[PDB]
Amino acid sequence: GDEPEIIAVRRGMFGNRDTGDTSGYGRLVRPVALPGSTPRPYGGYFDAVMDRLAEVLGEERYAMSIERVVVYRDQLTIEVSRVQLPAVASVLRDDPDLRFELCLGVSGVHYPEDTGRELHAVYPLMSITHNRRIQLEVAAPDADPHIPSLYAVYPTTDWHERETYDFFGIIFDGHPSLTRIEMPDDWEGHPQRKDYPLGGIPVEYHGAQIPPPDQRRSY
Amino acid sequence: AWACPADAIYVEGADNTADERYSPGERYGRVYQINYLRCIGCGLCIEACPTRALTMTTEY
Amino acid sequence: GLEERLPGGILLSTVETVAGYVRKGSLWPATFGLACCAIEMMSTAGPRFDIARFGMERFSATPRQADLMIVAGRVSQKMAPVLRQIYDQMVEPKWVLAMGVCASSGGMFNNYAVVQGVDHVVPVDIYLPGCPPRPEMLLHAILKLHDKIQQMPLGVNREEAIREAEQAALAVPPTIELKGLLR
Amino acid sequence: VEMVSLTIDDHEISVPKGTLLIRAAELMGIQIPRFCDHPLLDPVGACRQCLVEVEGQRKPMASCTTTVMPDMVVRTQFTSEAADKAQRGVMELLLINHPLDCPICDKGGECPLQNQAMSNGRPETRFEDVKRTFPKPISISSQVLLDRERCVLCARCTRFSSQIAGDPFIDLMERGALQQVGIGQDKPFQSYFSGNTVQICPVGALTGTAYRFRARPFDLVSSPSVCEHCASGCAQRTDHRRGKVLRRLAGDEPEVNEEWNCDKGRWAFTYATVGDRITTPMLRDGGVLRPASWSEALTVAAAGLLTAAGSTGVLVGGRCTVEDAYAYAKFARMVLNTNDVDFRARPHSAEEAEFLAAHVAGQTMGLRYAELENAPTVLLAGFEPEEESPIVFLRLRKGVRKNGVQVVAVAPWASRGLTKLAGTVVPTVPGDEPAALDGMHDDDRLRRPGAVILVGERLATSPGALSAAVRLAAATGARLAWIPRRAGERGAIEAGALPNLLPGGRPVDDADARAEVARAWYISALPEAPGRDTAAILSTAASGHLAALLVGGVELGDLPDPELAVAAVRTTPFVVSLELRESAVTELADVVFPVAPVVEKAGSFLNWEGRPRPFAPSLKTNAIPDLRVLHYLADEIGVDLALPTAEAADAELAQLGTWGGARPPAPTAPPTARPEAGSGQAVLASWRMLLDAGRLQDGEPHLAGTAVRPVARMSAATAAGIGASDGAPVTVSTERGAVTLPLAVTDMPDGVVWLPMNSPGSAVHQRLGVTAGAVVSIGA
Amino acid sequence: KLGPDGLGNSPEHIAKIMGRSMEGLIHHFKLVTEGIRVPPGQVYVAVESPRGELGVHMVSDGGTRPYRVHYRDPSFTNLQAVAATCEGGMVADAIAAVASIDPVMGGVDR
Amino acid sequence: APLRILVYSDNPRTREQVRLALGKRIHPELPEIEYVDVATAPMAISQMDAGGFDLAILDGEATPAGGMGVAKQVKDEIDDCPPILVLTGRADDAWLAKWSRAEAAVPHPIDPIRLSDAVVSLLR
Ligand SMILES: CC(C)=CCC/C(C)=C/CC/C(C)=C/CC/C(C)=C/CC/C(C)=C\CC/C(C)=C/CC/C(C)=C/CC/C(C)=C\CC/C(C)=C/CC1=C(C)C(=O)c2ccccc2C1=O
Ligand SMILES: Nc1nc2c(ncn2[C@@H]2O[C@H](COP(=O)(O)OP(=O)(O)OP(=O)(O)O)[C@@H](O)[C@H]2O)c(=O)[nH]1
Ligand code: SF4
Ligand code: SF4
Ligand code: SF4
Ligand code: SF4
Ligand code: SF4
Ligand code: FES
């Protein structure tokens, strides 16, 4: 579907996360939508890239693999379909017209309020020969956080994919060894998830203490 | 204290009154603590203060 | 050691004074930087200042030779075991300087990942604010540690001081109870 | 549900006929700036902040007042440059006279004016002239401080105090630029719902004196919560800084309380910190109450309770979460093998327990607040909604204003609450209520579909009253609901904390019910002997036939015969008290356990409609709830109560489920003849004022200073018969003692004197030791 | 602005927001306390840090706090080269290689 | 004989809280409990070196030297060291409590029954 992804639904004015400190202002319903798919004439080389991609992949393979294309602030995001990620990445790296040699890493981002698409892995790719860059985005559910690892295509991802797992639990199936890299192997939970509490302690003061920022009010 | 990224300032306001006035106006900082084992010296507090009551000396 | 078994008369006093002098004047740090504060510690050793002036040029690489531990950085959870191992592997007497807000109390990083003060894992002799503490502040803290070292008891005096400090410490009301003008 | 379709900005939506443009734009995600608008207040369009361009309209129209018409086109500030200009100009004009007070204004950080001046305001002032100035702040009551300069004169406070609450003790005053919200001259604001104005003001004009300068929004730990005080079960938001609760805002729950509170719920939170709190387990030794460990205290309590065995009674009180009541009941059933369980720490009767078993217990979510608003006719028996469950009063007033709800009260005199409802009195002396109910079986208003009959807890005090009300409900077909005064009463009933009941409403006298609970408790069999009501338990203990009492959060002064109750607790050889604060029972008890207050414990209440009101522990503390205390006392006694937390108690209550079998018989008590008072004597009527001297209002002198001045009330005929005059201090009396209050001659049945039940200086139970409906002497 | 009493808000600004400019006061208060709220969206922006392509993935949920800020620190990726540049060589040469990578561990571990 | 429990914390209120959770006789099927209270790491260490303790409760939040560090030290330094219980000021501190090798860990605020049960488990 072309409808945007709503990562959150703000209720009420002033960004209240709960009932709100003034009465009568909580009735607004503002969904938090990320940008939807760009219409078609993607700016700059983006079209030149995507068209080329659509050429190297078939119409059927391209349609099954690329879920969405989002140009935002002159940055091209290819919301790629899970499972098909290794094929698309191989096409990007190998194709002379794309030739995105440099995958700069993998970053997990958690959207608990995005149904069936809770965990997004972002792959910044750069083509040095063509002086281009794009960002693949693969969405996985929370209940099935498995994503295909790009190791065979981008070895640089091995540590990134590890950190992202450690921090989000995104299981990059096919990765040689998804061991926690930052946190201890015996650590419980995945800290960068929103469900994981900040785990701070109150700051002490003569006769008082300030609870961590995650407990106190916010807007 | 609002602006402090480190939660290194604790402020409790209280009323100025004729029998006891500490600052011009209706409010004053009765309690003012800085936890210097949390203060990172960023200076955001200073930029936050609207009265220049808070400044940063060069004493270190 | 036998030096502490001397009778509590003038011999033990003078030995304490000389030993404190020497230990304050030769307070070799361990080569144990962690973070930002480690860079500022190197800057303190750098020529603009001279930590060597205070007999502290030798950043001891091996914990065995090191008499002082400038934590100088943020102790993550995964580092607390290593930091404690290094501390325990120094040979006594040894003091610990919690350089920076991160080392002393966790600093701005009030989080799961950070231990919130090396005091959790090792006894702290002196706490040093700053983020990072500028090298002049590090030298100030080290001089305060020198003052602490010189006035250090030994033997029977050490036991008496431990007893007195324990008795005094049992009475201080906790920080959370020092409600002043706080309503 | 005629739906009208219209385009706001470029987009299109369809909304119910009559919906306001501002509501539609809210629904579609568009923040039209607004101050005077309020969803629950009748639109006034005063501030003109919410202007929008509407197709075919020359002028901008206040979106808050523009009803949606079919095929309309509207363009907000997001797409109409003209509407943007209108809103920004209104914003500027709104800020020119506003004080530069944000650092010192309590509303700073949570101010709608600040936020909407950021989103919809000019970068900087254009106003180089002189600002309007008022001397400020000025108190309009003991609780509310008014800052007129910050007042944007939106009239939301005034509109609330008129429409929502029938308390127009403030109004817009003066004229022109000088217009200001104000009280009359010195007559204080004086409304049980005054705090709502503080929460309704879109600026710092109205602030809570208690919360003044206490904190800024970033310094608050904020948690959802439920009020502890009456069966209304309002959603609230508890804010605490430094571990101390600073305020309790109204929250938002349209199915219960909309966005409202009463002053009791909003400010009566300091009770847990007045310095009387029980910090550690206490033990009686040498006649003195001494701090004790948990280990030693549990050892002693288990020893005593095992020594008493089945010669024990558990007074559960009404200050308990559903889980706490369930633990008390289960503890009584197994750990003590007794059925002497009663949450009624108040005037009560066996007929009350019978009625609660017959109609209330197990019958969840019948009559609902939403139903109240649409009931064509509402009858009130022994129930003063303003004084008892003020939010029920708010809903009834809302029904009166919107859907023409007709309200009838069987009461001695028209209470201010009833008058605000436009309700009609059925003047009847206390005790004579059953006759009133029996005389209403032919009333056509109750025969109307959706008619409702609300019975207050006080109706239990009158013999034959509850059975009469049940008969009336059956004969007319109107839905009958019973609305207690304490938040834990209904949860206690659902917890089976009555002598005749078990969890889920299943009766004790039913063998199959006993088997179901015994299985669900993995136990052989529950006791079969009929339990003893609280009055029975207390009279028994005063006789020395009771071996030990377990009193959980009960104030003896609230019982019908407090002298009897203090004697009962004193004579009992072993008294185990789970108390939040020191009291008569804690003072006279042998073992005292501290139980965490509501702010620091997870749990759930039940409101009068049966809706669960769950809440998480806002404060985190070493304190433990009644649940854990009872569970570990049982464990020390050697029985697995299996209630380590409120979550387990909720799971067990779900497992036991509703009774569903042969519903217990109706009470059908005979309407006993009322006493007749001779000359110099009258029948006592009374109900607890909302802001009475209750223990949980302690530590909040402002809220007390906002309480209604206690007064005796009489018919001019009866005052003349006693020789008194209005304003003269009339004294009522009985053997125990006398209560003296200024006389306020009231239109009411002759031979009846009304006193506040437990207002300061009244304390009718303690002073007189009689219930409502009892004959009491009177004099000048 | 500095003064005889140390670094502080410039007295001109204090006068502006506390004596004259109400909108100025509101803006100071809100931008300091709540801070700007960024439109929702994602953006990956890279710079040429001394140690390489320091990238930042930034995600905003329309709020005043960032929804996500992930640093692709160049040092973290460069440390993948310890195997390549150390294996097979002398330990003294491995030290030189690791130094040549110039890993700043703060960025590596973040 | 009476059991001696070393309760270590520089916060007097935490020591009182521990002494409240554990009565003079916890679990009346158990011996009497004797409390030696210490508010400094050196004194806690010296008392441990004296020995004869059945359990030591070390406040993980002790200011100049945390109870977890003291726990690791006492296990490394006293032969036949008595079991150690730690009070942790944070749920995330559990991992460090695991590293401290204390037989059990009780999060702050001290839950009386939880602490009593933990102690009974260690002293049994
Ligand atoms: C009336 C009258 C005239 C009487 C005179 C009596 C008198 C004074 C006697 C003189 C003869 C003596 C001394 C006899 C007494 C008996 C005796 C010899 C005892 C020895 C006891 C002993 C083994 C040790 C105690 C100390 C002592 C005095 C030992 C000998 C002298 C020395 C200097 C020995 C060890 C010290 C030493 C050489 C090295 C210490 C270790 C280091 C690393 C040194 C410092 C140092 C070095 C070397 C770096 O490389 C470096 C590089 C970059 C930055 C910093 C550093 C740094 O800090
Ligand atoms: N065991 C227990 N006791 C409580 C709890 N909450 C309050 N209490 C105590 O219960 C006692 C009696 O409370 P109430 O019967 O409600 O008296 P009140 O505060 O005047 O309330 P009203 O009945 O409306 O007048 C008080 O002294 C409190 O200390 C609780 O959660 N558990
Ligand atoms: S310098 Fe000021 S703003 Fe920054 S951390 Fe320290 S107290 Fe807070
Ligand atoms: S205290 Fe500040 S300067 Fe020192 S290591 Fe921590 S973050 Fe860096
Ligand atoms: S009411 Fe709002 S705008 Fe006015 S001074 Fe207070 S915070 Fe500032
Ligand atoms: S006091 Fe508040 S609610 Fe009343 S008119 Fe003024 S701004 Fe509006
Ligand atoms: S009406 Fe009752 S439940 Fe609602 S806020 Fe007031 S006291 Fe609390
Ligand atoms: S909100 Fe519509 S005119 Fe005020």
DSSP D186-242: S-----TTHHHHHHH-SSTTEEETTTTTS--GGG-EEEEEE-SSSTT--EEEEEEET
Distance CA C53, CA C146 (A): 13
Three-state secondary structure call for residue E88: coil
Q: What is the CATH number of domain C2-177?
A: 3.40.50.12280
- Is-contact D182 D168, C-beta < 8 A? no
Which residue has its alpha carbon closest to ligand 2 atom 10? D553
Distance CA E83, CA E98 (A): 10
Q: How close is the Cα of D230 to the center of ligand 7, in Å?
A: 6
Element (H, E) at A70: strand A66-72
What single-letter DSSP state applies at residue D609? T
In the block, tokens 């101010």 appear at D111
- Is-contact D183 D157, C-beta < 8 A? no
Compute how many other C-beta atoms are within 10 angstroms of the C-beta atom of residue E4. 5
- Residues with Cβ within 8 Å of A82's Cβ and at least 6 positions away in sequence, in order, are A138, A139, A140, A147, A148
Beta strands in E1-110 (DSSP E): 41-49, 52-60, 68-72
Beta strands in chain C (DSSP E): 68-70, 95-99, 126-128
Distance CA D613, CA D82 (A): 47
Backbone angles phi, psi at F114, to 5 degrees: -60, -45
In angstroms, what is the C-alpha Rg of chain C? 18
**Which of F54, F22, F58, F59 shows the shortest CA–CA distance to F124?**
F54
Contacts of A205 in chain B (CB under 8 A): 10, 33, 35
Hey, are the CB atoms on C131 and B39 less than 8 Å from each other? yes
Distance CA D145, CA D205 (A): 8
Three-state secondary structure call for residue A159: helix
The neighbouring-strand residues paired with C98 are C127
Residue F25: which of D296, D624, D628 has the nearest Cβ?
A: D296
Break chain C into its structural domains and give their ranges: 2-177
- Residues with Cβ within 8 Å of D673's Cβ and at least 6 positions away in sequence, in order, are none
Compute how many other C-beta atoms are within 10 angstroms of the C-beta atom of residue E43. 16
Q: Give Cα separations from C106 to B40, C115, D384 (angstroms).
A: 11, 6, 56
Hey, are the CB atoms on A201 and F95 less than 8 Å from each other? no
The neighbouring-strand residues paired with A132 are A127
Compute how many other C-beta atoms are within 10 angstroms of the C-beta atom of residue F83. 17
Distance CA E6, CA E28 (A): 21
Three-state secondary structure call for residue E7: strand
Compute how many other C-beta atoms are within 10 angstroms of the C-beta atom of residue D492. 34
* CB of C73 sitting under 6 A from ligand 4: yes
Hey, are the CB atoms on A184 and F89 less than 8 Å from each other? no
Q: Where are the alpha helices (DSSP H) in D381-509?
A: 390-403, 416-420, 433-438, 444-447, 465-476, 487-494
CA distance C112 to chain B (A): 15
Distance CA A58, CA C102 (A): 55
**Which of E3, D175, C79, D332 shows the shortest CA–CA distance to A183?**
C79
Distance CA F100, CA F97 (A): 5
**Cα dihedral sign, F52-F56-F62-F67:** positive
- Is-contact A31 D29, C-beta < 8 A? yes
DSSP D711-766: -EEE-HHHHHHTT--TTSEEEEE-SS-EEEEEEEE-SS-TTEEEEESSSTTT-HHH
Rounded to the nearest angstrom, the gap between the alpha carbon of residue D719 and the centroid of all alpha carbons in its chain is: 33
Break chain F into its structural domains and give their ranges: 1-124
Q: Are strands D406-410 and D377-381 parallel, antiparallel or unpaired?
A: parallel
CA distance F4 to chain D (A): 16
Residue C182: which of A197, A200, A207 has the nearest Cβ?
A: A207
Q: Is D643 on the interface with F (CB under 8 A)?
A: no
- Is-contact A130 A149, C-beta < 8 A? no
Q: Is B26 on the interface with D (CB under 8 A)?
A: yes
DSSP C93-135: S-EEEEEHHHHHH-TT--SSSB-S-GGGTS--SEEE--SSPPH
Binding residue numbers of B for [4Fe-4S] cluster: 4, 39, 42, 45, 49
Rounded to the nearest angstrom, the gap between the alpha carbon of residue D124 and the centroid of all alpha carbons in its chain is: 46
Distance CA D171, CA D184 (A): 8
Buried b (16+ CB within 10 A) or exposed e, D472-486: bbeebebbbbbbbbb
3-state SS track over D123-153: CCCCCCCCCCCCCCCEECCCCEEECCCCCCC
**Which of D780, D740, D747 shows the shortest CA–CA distance to D761?**
D740
Structure token digits, residue D427: 């003047």
**Cα dihedral sign, F43-F49-F53-F58:** positive
Rounded to the nearest angstrom, the gap between the alpha carbon of residue D7 and the centroid of all alpha carbons in its chain is: 43
Determine the residue of chain C that is closest to B10 in CA distance.
C182
Cα-Cα-Cα-Cα dihedral of A16, A20, A24, A28, to 10°? 20
The ligand placed nearest to the CA atom of residue D599 is 2
Compute how many other C-beta atoms are within 10 angstroms of the C-beta atom of residue F45. 20
Q: Give Cα separations from D72 to D24, D37, D48, D76, F121 (angstroms).
A: 12, 21, 20, 13, 74
* CB of D108 sitting under 6 A from ligand 5: yes
Q: Which chains touch C (3 or more CB pairs under 8 A)?
A: A, B, E, F
Cα-Cα-Cα-Cα dihedral of E94, E97, E103, E109, to 10°? -40
State the Cα angle at D64 between D60 and D67, rounded to 5°.
85
Residues 67-106 of E with CB under 8 A from C: 105-106
- Is-contact D591 D283, C-beta < 8 A? yes
The neighbouring-strand residues paired with D581 are D277
Q: Are strands D729-733 and D591-594 parallel, antiparallel or unpaired?
A: unpaired
Hey, are the CB atoms on C182 and B31 less than 8 Å from each other? yes
Buried b (16+ CB within 10 A) or exposed e, E58-85: bbbbbbbeebbebbbbbbbbbbeeeeeb
Size of interface B-D (CB pairs under 8 A): 22
- Is-contact D282 D587, C-beta < 8 A? no
Crossing angle, helix D487-494 and helix D322-330, to 10 degrees?
Answer: 50
Query: Binding residue per annotation — C152?
Result: no
- Is-contact E46 E55, C-beta < 8 A? yes
The ligand placed nearest to the CA atom of residue D267 is 7
The resolution in angstroms reads: 2.8
Element (H, E) at E94: helix E91-101
Compute how many other C-beta atoms are within 10 angstroms of the C-beta atom of residue E35. 13
- Is-contact D407 D373, C-beta < 8 A? no
Distance CA B9, CA B13 (A): 13
**Which of D86, D94, D81, D91 shows the shortest CA–CA distance to D63?**
D86
Q: Is D109 on the interface with B (CB under 8 A)?
A: yes
* CB of D41 sitting under 6 A from ligand 6: no
- Residues with Cβ within 8 Å of D85's Cβ and at least 6 positions away in sequence, in order, are none
Buried b (16+ CB within 10 A) or exposed e, D666-695: bbebebeebeebeeebbbbbbbbbbbbbbb
Q: Give Cα separations from D412 to D418, D433, D698 (angstroms).
A: 12, 10, 30
Compute how many other C-beta atoms are within 10 angstroms of the C-beta atom of residue D424. 14
Q: Give Cα separations from D689 to D145, D168, D188 (angstroms).
A: 24, 20, 18
In angstroms, what is the C-alpha Rg of chain F? 13
Element (H, E) at A136: strand A132-140
What single-letter DSSP state applies at residue D11? E
Size of interface A-C (CB pairs under 8 A): 45
Three-state secondary structure call for residue E76: helix
Q: Is D672 on the interface with F (CB under 8 A)?
A: no
* CB of D319 sitting under 6 A from ligand 6: no
Q: Give Cα separations from E18 to A175, B52, D121, D324, D491 (angstroms).
A: 60, 11, 18, 53, 53
Three-state secondary structure call for residue F2: coil
Hey, are the CB atoms on B58 and E18 less than 8 Å from each other? no
Binding residue numbers of D for [2Fe-2S] cluster: 35-37, 47-50, 64
